[PDB]
Amino acid sequence: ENPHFFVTSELSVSKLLKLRQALNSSAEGRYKLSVNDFLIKAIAVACKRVPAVNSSWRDGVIRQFDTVDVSVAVATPTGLITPIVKGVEAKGLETISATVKELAKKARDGKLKPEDYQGGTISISNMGMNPAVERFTAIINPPQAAILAVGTTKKVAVPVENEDGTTGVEWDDQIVVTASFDHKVVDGAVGAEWMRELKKVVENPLELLL
Amino acid sequence: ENPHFFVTSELSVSKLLKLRQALNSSAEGRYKLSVNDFLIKAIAVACKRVPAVNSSWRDGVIRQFDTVDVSVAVATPTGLITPIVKGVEAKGLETISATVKELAKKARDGKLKPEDYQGGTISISNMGMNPAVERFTAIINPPQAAILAVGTTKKVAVPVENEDGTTGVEWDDQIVVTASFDHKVVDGAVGAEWMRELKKVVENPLELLL
């Protein structure tokens, strides 16, 4: 029913990894941030910058949402459930990480209420904990217009300019992301622009601070 | 009427200055962050951690506020006005800087509405643009329980341990801050704790990211 199209990007996470390390060292056990928390915040910023992706199909209309409620895919013994982080734009990374850990526990325990997993405006699915999944596509969760699939981290050789003008080799830690879009709502231009903003914010994570 | 007491701290801003420089260079003219925007955000975080400072005196009761609406003192040709940044906890630094510049312009133009300057929960007054004001006290703006006065930046000699075990001299850029508190509401212990959290967050500005 949905004309799926896929847009893929490689993202450098070296700076994000350094930032995560510094923050987790400074947390004194109050929280433990994952890469997923940073990706969720960057998604929320990008959705605020390109609201057309923050929308849903309805009969005859596109419902654009003013809030970004991110449904996070959690595998359970009974399979996939999508608890919802509401109002992500207004939450700090600590609150996001804590909420996600709590909700994922409730998910595994089967104690989620319908309001915990009914609704949401965009989904994220992160399987990067499995080293055999470098890239995958995810099926859109209707009625959302977009889903971001996030693969595992791998080291990739990248060219570095040496001071002598030779090109050396640096090893960049990259993840592959693939956005699946519903072509009724989001065309290729909007999706590519949103992917550009996501890349920009993730590779310069100080923009996550604005 | 108010038993004023004062608590003073020296704050290292070297790291904050570096961060401000990097962000302003990356802004591409979209925004121009000042030190004041960082201090406002750090204040909002500290007020969220110690809500007893985020309160107001009323006849017979302390009204504690769930939101931190920061009144920012702006000098005008007609003197002092206090436009209010509402909901600071949920705003990014870009939105804060833009809002403050807009409101300060409206203030100078005399086009502020009463709702722009009536209310607020805590005040900040920043005179650090004048190099002859290293330290000052500010008079509390009733009914708020606290006001932070922020002086100018000066270089101070600080001891540094050299690799040889000698103590060298480093030059730390420090500001002096002075909080004035209403002793009916906030005692010395709460004020000192809040000053500790402010210092901690400003000197480790990555905590401003949480």
Next chain:
Amino acid sequence: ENPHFFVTSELSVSKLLKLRQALNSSAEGRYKLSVNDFLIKAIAVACKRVPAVNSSWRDGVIRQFDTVDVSVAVATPTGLITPIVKGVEAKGLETISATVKELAKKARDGKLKPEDYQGGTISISNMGMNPAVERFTAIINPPQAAILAVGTTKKVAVPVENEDGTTGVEWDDQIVVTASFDHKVVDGAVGAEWMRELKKVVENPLELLL
């Protein structure tokens, strides 16, 4: 009601720290002296040398006291209480330290009798255990005429004359103290003289032995 004025001094504690270390090492667990015990004794000596500070306002008269009963501010979960060390001039440092620890425990336990905290002739408040409080003012505890606020210890670069006639840098451990005085009773001259005697005795702690 009280015309508060403030007099501030930086005090070298390097010698006091060395003396405290030697005494605590020699105590064999009988006692454990804090800097606060030394400051209390020095206060008692200074109050004996300048009795005009050792006085209280009454309707029409200044009641000068022959004894120095020092009220020590202790933070409790219910806030501030002021247990009284009576007859400080006649007590040794061991007795002072033991009494203060016992009374502070009773304070936290809420087991102080009125006679333990009603009265006193001068107060001390010591917040130097918080590294974010370099300087503060304390509100006078009526009817006492004076209160000494004691901030935290910091290292300060001080000039030292080298044997070659060059000026090197030494690192002096300094505390900031601020006396608040009631200008009805104590004028600036008496307060400055008393601050001079306090500085003299603290920086030459052998005078605490006389």
Next chain:
Amino acid sequence: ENPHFFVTSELSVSKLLKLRQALNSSAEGRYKLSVNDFLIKAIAVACKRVPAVNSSWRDGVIRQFDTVDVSVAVATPTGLITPIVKGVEAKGLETISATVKELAKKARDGKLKPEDYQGGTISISNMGMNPAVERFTAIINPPQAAILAVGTTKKVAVPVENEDGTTGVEWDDQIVVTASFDHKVVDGAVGAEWMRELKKVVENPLELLL
């Protein structure tokens, strides 16, 4: 009754000390200038540049004064008296020093007439002769709008750029000054501007010549 607020500045006196030395050496006993005479003249110049500080509260009106009559606080065995140097703008430093010494003697002798100490437009209190008073606040002498408290001189390490681009240490002789202002008459902006002019004139004492 008076909303007191305090503005503090560190002032370099190295150049003023050199100038005082040269002048006193050239006086051949005709006069003996103190630092206080220079501060009085600089105050008079600053008051002429910012007359709003040179004013007094009256019921319903601010009386701005065209002349600067500086009341100088003198400690006596009976305490504080404020003899008045009239028309300071038109007097040279020699006349100021001579008048101050004469009036201070009459003060100690109790031979001041009411006209010698009734009135005045601004006060100065100088306790810098006591090395234990680095900083203090003074209570405003009504109906004057401002009082300047002047602490003692201390040596402070300041950064100096060496010819090799290293940062050495220089020892600057600094005094701390604290102006107390009545917030009904003088707001923070005017007080900070006046403090700026005072600093400018004291640090570049050739401007005292204009």
